[PDB]
Design a protein. Structure first.
Length: 188
């Protein structure tokens, strides 16, 4: 077949009931994630090919970068609660991997301030139970799939993308193969 289990994707032994349709995991410490966001724009090209009625979810993980890793998962909860993902993703990636100006929670906070979220608004979010539950959701979803590596994408809680088995000679071709694979899996 043209799409083979074990080739462009793998099947979960232990399928995850009720999971989001397209579920993506990343870390601001993760170098392929930087690439996926800044150079390849994976999330975006997947969206552009997904059917109608299919929502896309993206979660941060704790297992990279120790304490800062966890702060970042809480900051991403804040970003999701306020709907400001599109305004903080690039500066968080660049602050962590390019400029190395993010070394503490206060430095994470600065990124939001500079992006125009009000201090007051950020700190209230940071400390809110709605954000605590959003952190729990991120952790649970990673836990439900035994996640030890990022970037990762799961379709309908049963299929996991396998980019290792795709040509990387041309970046554009890679992205389309990736998005086309998500679409195929979505229709499965």
């Amino acid at each position: 077949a043209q799409y083979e289990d074990g080739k462009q994707y793998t099947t979960l032994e232990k399928p995850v009931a009720g999971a989001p349709q397209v579920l993506e995991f990343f870390s601001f410490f993760c170098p392929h994630c930087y690439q996926f966001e800044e150079v390849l724009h994976i999330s975006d090209n997947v969206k552009k090919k997904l059917p109608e009625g299919v929502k896309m979810t993206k979660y941060h993980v704790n297992f990279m970068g120790g304490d800062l890793g966890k702060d970042l998962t809480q900051a991403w909860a804040v970003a999701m609660a306020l709907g400001v993902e599109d305004k903080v993703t690039v500066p968080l990636f660049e602050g962590v991997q390019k400029t190395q100006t993010i070394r503490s929670a206060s430095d994470i906070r600065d990124v939001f301030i500079n992006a125009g979220i009000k201090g007051e608004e950020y700190d209230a979010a940071w400390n809110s139970f709605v954000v605590k539950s959003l952190v729990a959701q991120q952790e649970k979803a990673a836990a439900d799939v035994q996640l030890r590596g990022v970037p990762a994408m799961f379709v309908n809680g049963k299929y996991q993308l396998n980019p290792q088995g795709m040509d990387t000679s041309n970046m554009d071709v890679f992205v389309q193969q990736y998005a086309d694979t998500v679409k195929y899996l979505s229709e499965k």
